[PDB]
Amino acid sequence: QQEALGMVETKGLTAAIEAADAMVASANVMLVGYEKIGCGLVTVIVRGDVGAVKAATDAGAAAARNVGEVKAVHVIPRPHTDVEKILPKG
Amino acid sequence: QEALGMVETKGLTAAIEAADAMVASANVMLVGYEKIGCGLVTVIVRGDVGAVKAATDAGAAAARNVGEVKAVHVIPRPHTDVEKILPK
Amino acid sequence: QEALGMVETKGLTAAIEAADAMVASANVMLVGYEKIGCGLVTVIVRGDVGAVKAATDAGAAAARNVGEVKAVHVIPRPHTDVEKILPK
Amino acid sequence: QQEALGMVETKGLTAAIEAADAMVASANVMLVGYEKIGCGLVTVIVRGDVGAVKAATDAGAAAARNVGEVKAVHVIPRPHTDVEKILPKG
Amino acid sequence: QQEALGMVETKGLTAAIEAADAMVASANVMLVGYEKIGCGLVTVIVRGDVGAVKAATDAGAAAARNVGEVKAVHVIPRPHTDVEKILPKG
Amino acid sequence: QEALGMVETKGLTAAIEAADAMVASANVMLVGYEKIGCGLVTVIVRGDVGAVKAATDAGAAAARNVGEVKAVHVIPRPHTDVEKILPK
């Protein structure tokens, strides 16, 4: 019953924006937000159906890797508290 | 009895994976995140000593597949009350 | 048609030079700056695809004489509305 | 007449929290606070009787060194303006 | 009709303050402000007549280089939108 | 006559030791601290040129036993009024 969670972390904001844009191409994936965490790292987070999020994060990481470095790509299909409990800030 | 668990990662994504696993792996409450620079993020949980011990281990393990884990530690009973010592 | 342009620099001064040149070099609106740590600064502009393409090229070029350029990129049409995807 | 001042600086928050916890074991030592200063550095600060603070900072640094790196341990026995003048924020 | 824009970027705040002080020696140069951008980098910005700003930034960089590292010195003689449009915060 | 003194350290603790010593070592007022990233902290004092000169020397010396000192400098008379040039 929980939406899935998708992350793409990049070094560089531009890569993260490219990532985000690509991830939201598919209209069933909502962009939760960015998170700066220092030393140029930016984490783009998206919510949605497991398969969509899977496809989106892959698409996002792919888009991003042509613009700057990609430090992580990960999907959490069934978050264990509410998405909001486990996230810090949209 | 009641305790504090930490997993510190380089990368937010690793920390989120850590957090999710820690909640999944035992009856522990997720206190929260803390950014401290250069991509380091500290996930913190409260709960029963054994649960927290199991959760932090599970969290660090999950996390290590996503990014780097810089620390894993449990404080089995904090010397001011369990959250007094946290800054958050 | 309508688009997004980015020039990321190490150094604020390089980013300001970049911004100034981007505005000079075509009919493009300067959205703004974003600091993301360790001296990295991302200048962002909106406008017509070709203008933004020309501006980002001009901006990166200007900037490279002042400090390091870490990225130059154009998103010719952003998939939420042009500013929806930006955090600023 | 001034309380003494104790510092333990660590790379890593977890080390600093361990440090703080250990330092406050002794009920005559008050924890002033944490200070993040970048690149993972965190400074734990405590106030109290000179001897207590001496003992606490030593205990804290010790606790901490098993969890992450310790970058400084220092005691200022008699601060020269008020503790509050010389500190930035609790 | 636009004022010119002068920048001196330093690693170290002390260098930047020395830079700023030197730049404002000449009464026809207004100090816009500082900007921290991470990893010890600080950007001092000044506004004024093209020649003054030219002279000031040179003087500032010079002063600064004896105190810490100078990462950039640059003058934009005729900013293309208003100075305020192209700047982030005084 | 009236002046500005700076000691920049890597580490807050070194900066606090520096500050304490600077106040101890002469008739100088402590303006304040400034964090600027990667553990760098700049302690600033105002006062009589000679006092500030003596204090900054004393401060840097104290500090060097605790952590790294990145800069020591005195501006004997600031060209806008003594605090105008500071950002704090």
Coordinates of C-alpha atoms in Angstrom, one line a residue, chain E residues 10-55:
Chain E
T10 CA 40.3 34.0 -1.5
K11 CA 40.8 30.9 0.4
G12 CA 40.6 32.1 4.0
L13 CA 38.3 34.8 5.5
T14 CA 41.3 36.8 6.8
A15 CA 42.7 37.2 3.3
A16 CA 39.2 38.3 2.1
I17 CA 38.9 40.9 4.9
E18 CA 42.4 42.2 4.1
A19 CA 41.4 42.3 0.5
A20 CA 38.2 44.2 1.3
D21 CA 39.9 46.7 3.5
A22 CA 42.5 47.5 0.9
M23 CA 39.8 47.7 -1.8
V24 CA 37.8 50.3 0.1
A25 CA 40.9 52.5 0.7
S26 CA 39.7 54.5 -2.3
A27 CA 36.6 56.4 -1.4
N28 CA 35.0 55.9 -4.9
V29 CA 34.6 52.1 -4.5
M30 CA 31.7 50.7 -2.5
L31 CA 31.9 47.3 -0.9
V32 CA 28.9 45.2 -1.9
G33 CA 29.7 42.2 0.4
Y34 CA 31.2 38.8 1.2
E35 CA 30.0 35.4 0.0
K36 CA 31.1 32.1 1.6
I37 CA 30.9 29.3 -0.9
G38 CA 32.5 26.4 1.0
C39 CA 35.9 24.9 1.6
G40 CA 37.1 28.2 3.1
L41 CA 36.5 30.2 -0.1
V42 CA 35.2 33.7 0.3
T43 CA 34.4 36.2 -2.5
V44 CA 34.6 39.9 -1.8
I45 CA 32.6 42.0 -4.2
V46 CA 32.8 45.7 -4.9
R47 CA 30.9 48.2 -7.1
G48 CA 32.1 51.5 -8.7
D49 CA 33.7 53.4 -11.5
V50 CA 35.5 51.1 -14.0
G51 CA 38.9 52.5 -13.3
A52 CA 38.5 52.6 -9.5
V53 CA 37.3 49.0 -9.4
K54 CA 40.1 48.0 -11.7
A55 CA 42.6 49.6 -9.3

